[PDB]
Symmetry: C7
Subunit: 265 residues, 7 copies
């Protein structure tokens, strides 16, 4: 009948009493981390935080059941490495699945901690531009106009270009025919920058920026206060159109030279 | 004949009795997690949940068989690290295979918990736009019109743009010839915004783009959720008729050509 | 000469007898999992299931040989962590190789368990559309017409759009010249929807797009599963004939040219 | 001088004798797995299988040397976890490198075991089409005509579309001007299907697409494996001649131009 | 009643006292790594470094609670490998999540340590060009003109091309009609290089006809220019080429199409 | 003062003497693996193999220093798992870094062992075509003409299409106007195949494609390895001259225009 | 009060003294690996190597602090596997972060050791072409003309094509109208190769492509390293002048139009 059979009992006992203490203690701490976020009603409708509370309860129960079971099993001569080879299917699947969640959060943490963009400026993130409306630490929300509300997981942000930082820059690339008088148009554009400066950096006439088949491209650019940009550009375009009509300068219509051939069928 | 030969027996015994208790206990808990989801008939046809029940039964049997066998093997001087190097081929294959499933679920969990889109709005998810019909936590189902029902694993969602949140925005980019009177057309579009406001933006933002023979002015209006593409169509019809009445010429591509005196 | 030299023998002995029992037991269980799937001839030609039986036999032999060998090696003072560092080259290679297989299967499991598509509807899976012919749990087979039979491993399915669920939707985007009378054509299309309704939507949604010399009005109709592309063709024929009777001019591109006085 | 110094010797001894037994035994088994595949000359030129034999020899030598050395080191108080941290650089590098090889093989195993394609049909695998010439379990070889012999590692196969299964399908999309009589052409194509049926589908499916100046009607026919592109060519020749006899005008783009009075 | 029951107590005791010493010691070191970066006010508004301080506090509390708890559990016969199979879900999730952060940092470390680009030159990084404004070790900030301020995590930099190193190079590809006199234009461009050399900033030179197309012919002029002098030189050269085209009366590279006329109807 | 203090010394001693033996033995084996590859001067300039020799020396030194230090540390009550958590940063970094090297090598091993391409044929590997000049087992070198010498790591090879195996195939797709006599041209091409056969396929496969104003007939011929592009050029010249003699009109795009009476 | 309380002290003592010896010894070795690279001033400004020295100091301090702390913790009954689950968050993050660095270096090591390109030739690496200026083992620096200095981490090199190895190859694809005399132009190009050979290939390979209104003959020549793009320009100038003298008409697109009698 041996002498250990009592010690053994002390062992399965130790596991049971520790697991019990554990459950009750967890239920306590959870009911407290509950008490707080619940009684103040700072954020989060109840319907959700209840689902989240039972989420945590369930998680901790399953963990405790698993540890106590595994331990008792050890007590009956079951090999824990083999058990590891089973349980680790889930260590691996959950661990690697959750990695992305951790990524999003670290990402968000920096976005915020480094004030990459404040809860209101107009940015472009991953070829998607819009005005930032919300900045959680798992997701940034950005609504472009005409485009919808984009919800973007912070981890996916590979680069965030901010459009409205230390100001903004407006550009217009005007196109003329090379079959055209350069100095007259550069003069006209000069006069347009002149006039625009008069209604509240630039705007200036940078040289002929590109030379093409039948066209010739001169850009005007101006440094503008945050957001006044696309507006400035539209002002400038209207100005260029009217200037084209008054100075009677011919338009950049593509043109062909054609050679005729004497044949039939 | 030694003294351990009885202890040894106690050990292979301990494994067998614990694995037996284990099986019966699992059969019990499974027949209970069965009893519940089965007797209430809340969801899921039986034909399926039966397949799923035998799934869990089989899984638990294989796990138990493996643990008990491995343990007995240990009892006969078989090295458990080597065993691990065998069994882990499966730990790794299953573990990393299942990772994606875990991903889908965490994904869905947030989509729901963060009300990213309600079981009814019109969204666009990975270059695919449609009306959300179902939101499980493993899959979102979205049917675009003319396009079919799309079933998208929640994990694949890299971004979800919602089109019908705090409202919507309608745009029309009208194109004219530069060989054209700007103020007359901008005046006409002004009159069209005027008129459209009258039936329950819309505004004329400047010339937004300047091209070879064209010139492009956009009108835009903030619209209640979904009235959007509709507003746009209203505005288009209006612009067509306005073009006919004001007799403004159309944005046909215009080429200017030069003739050459040759032969062959 | 010591005292253990007998115990040692008991240990190498324990390994050998357990490995022997193991082999014979495995051969048994395999000859049984054989007996079943073999004597009923439910599926799978013999030539294959024989190759698959010897596959399982060989695997189990190699695993047993490896575990027994590794254990005996342990008995001669060979370090099992170093052995692990060797054997795990294969644990890793096989484990990560097989992960994909496990992926395909979980994937298939859901496709079926969730009736994503039945053994007969017309779906599109990864930019490839066709009629589903077979649905295993490792591979879906889909044959498009004119396109061949596609065998797609279930894991590769990133999204599966079903075209024939709660019905279908037919669209036709009719193109006119903007140099054209809108209301006459919209009237004609109205008459065509009218007439098509009469043979067992279809409706005129506004001008959906406005281009350089064109203008685009869509007609759309909700159709029973598969009657779709058919409806569309009916509607096209109708629109062509309507264009001929109403004598409406065709959406030919149009260019206005300006002539220039030069030479060479 | 102690009492263990003899036991220690028994231990370094045990390792040496086991490693020696191991080497000799491996050299034996290798010379046997050699004897077989060598004396029958079933496949593989000698020059190669020699290189492969010394490959196995060397592999086994290095593994044995490493295990014996590591074990002796353990005997001199060298920590085996630290050793693992060294040796695992190679465990990881080899393990993960070889993963792809394991992938190719599992992949090939299924391609074969599931008769996805027989050693002779015309398939398309990863946007590359051709006739399968060889099917190993690590590589499929496919030669398109005019295109060269493609050797594709089985693992890279993400999808395999078979073109010559339960038959084949031939299509021809005929293009007409919309400025054209529909029923005359549809009648002519009817007559062409009629005539083609007579030489050992083919049917006129409606107007499948409507474009700027064109209109597209497709004819299609179910054909025996490979007779396909051939049927299509027959049908094309027929359609050309039919165009010449029925004198129907060709689908040349057409543009309408407007002339403008200007200068420079 | 046994004899160990006192030793056991010594063990749970040992854990508790070590964990307590640990907490207090960490609070100390944290309050010191605090004292420094805080009292000098070298960088970082307080509002942030407070959030960061409580971050480190909380981290270390959770780690200590977990270690002590796990160790007591071990004391009550709880298997630590099974525990590992639970806790490693987090080992793996955090570890692999944080990998990217470590990447960014090693990346930045080299960018800086190798002076790949100084806090002022004009670079192009991942198809995105601009002037570098800030170089942290986690992020490079680059503002293109007309383009906005780009904040790029250092890890994402797969290649960094610098445009303003040992100088710069200006190019202009001039296009003519093949229906044209080559030597007259090559002569004119020669005269333009000549004249541009005369206004201050290697080149500019007339490299041969670099490309031949349907109705066009393309001759490039190029010049080595001091850092940033570049796009400017190019614009000078373009203006010069336009005016040269007007004076030398050379005809423009308009696309040209020969047409053949056909006698038909409908 | 205790009794172990001498045993302890025996332990740090055992580590030091084993590590010393280790170093000297490694220096030996390295100076031998040196002696061989060095005195025969089979390949590799000295300047390199010297750098490689000191590489191996240094590696082995660092490994030995680390093992012995780690072991002594263990002797002073330092925990080896925590050590592992440090040292494994490097285990992981080096192990996963080197994985690609192992990949390249296994890859090259098969390329060679399977004679996928001999040190001289013209292949295309990853959208890059050229003549193979060198085949190492870590890198294949291929020089296309006009294109430069490409050095490609063997691991990056996802597919290798060989162009010059069991021969080659030459294709020419001749384009005519549909506004054209089919049989006259097919006749002419017949005569060209006839004539080309006469100088040491080629055949007229039907009209392989039908387009807006064009019609495309292909001729194809099976040619000895490399004579291919050459054959094609022969055939093209032939087709041009045949076009000139048979006076057949060229496949110029043709557009029918409609004229409109307007202004501005 | 027990008997161990002194041994325990010996243990925490052992850790402290070994850690102290450890620190001092590391400070020494670091101050030596400092002494060398510092007093010779071979490379690296001081400002940097100082930052790098304190880097190594700090690294070693943190590792030592962590090992000693972990070990004392172990002494107070703290479980080391739990500790590992904590500390390995960093093992994994650092280990996998640094993997890329290890990759770059192995990569560079081969680039150099295999003289893939010398500190001076013109190469193209990942669709980016330029002259190599520097070759470190972590980064290759290449400056294209007009393009800037590219700094490329060696690990990112997937393929390196060298343009200036065993020489170079120059190509010019001349385009003519098919409406043209082939033999006259092929004759002229022959004369141009003739003349170019005269100033220190070049050959007329057949008509390499046949298009709608064009026809393309390539001339090619094998040229000394770098003389290539230059040769090509010579050849182009020659072809233009040859076109002017032989009066051959230019490859202008040509379109045949058909006129239609309509209105609006
Ligand atoms: C969760 C705790 C935090 C992570 C701690 C990581 C510290 C860094 C340690 C790197 C040591 C690498 O050393 C490596 O160990 C692993 C153990 O998984 C062994 O891996 C071996 O056994 C496993 C068992 O599951 C097999 O599935 C695997 O295929 C096989 O290679 C390698 O053969 C060995 O080379
Ligand atoms: C093969 C294994 C590969 C392992 C790779 C090793 C990873 C480390 C890569 C470089 C990390 C960045 O290097 C970073 O430099 C700064 C100095 O600018 C260090 O900063 C250091 O000096 C500063 C003074 O300003 C102190 O505040 C700090 O206590 C100290 O650590 C950072 O602590 C270090 O993180």
């Amino acid at each position: 009948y041996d002498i250990k059979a009592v010690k053994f009992l002390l062992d399965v006992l130790k596991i049971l009493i520790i697991a019990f203490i554990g459950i009750k203690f967890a239920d306590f701490l959870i009911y407290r981390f509950y008490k707080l976020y619940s009684k103040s009603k700072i954020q989060l409708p109840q319907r959700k935080i209840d689902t989240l509370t039972s989420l945590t309860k369930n998680a901790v129960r399953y963990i405790i059941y698993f540890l106590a079971g595994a331990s008792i099993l050890k007590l009956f001569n079951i090999d824990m490495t083999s058990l590891l080879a089973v349980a680790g299917i889930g260590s691996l699947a959950i661990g690697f699945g959750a990695q992305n969640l951790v990524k999003d959060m670290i990402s968000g943490f920096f976005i915020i901690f480094e004030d990459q963009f404040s809860v209101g400026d107009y940015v472009t993130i991953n070829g998607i531009s819009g005005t930032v409306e919300e900045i959680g630490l798992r997701v940034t929300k950005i609504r472009g106009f005409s485009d919808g509300l984009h919800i973007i997981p912070n981890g996916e942000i590979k680069m965030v270009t901010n459009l409205t930082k230390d100001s903004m820059m407006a550009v217009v690339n005007i196109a003329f025919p090379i079959d055209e008088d350069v100095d007259k148009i550069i003069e006209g554009l000069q006069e347009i920058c002149e006039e625009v400066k008069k209604s509240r950096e630039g705007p200036t006439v940078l040289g002929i920026t590109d030379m093409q088949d039948s066209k010739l491209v001169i850009m005007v650019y101006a440094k503008t206060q945050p957001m006044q940009k696309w507006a400035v550009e539209r002002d400038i375009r209207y100005r260029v159109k009217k200037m084209f009509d008054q100075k009677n300068i011919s338009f950049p219509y593509p043109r062909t030279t054609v050679i005729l051939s004497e044949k039939k069928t």
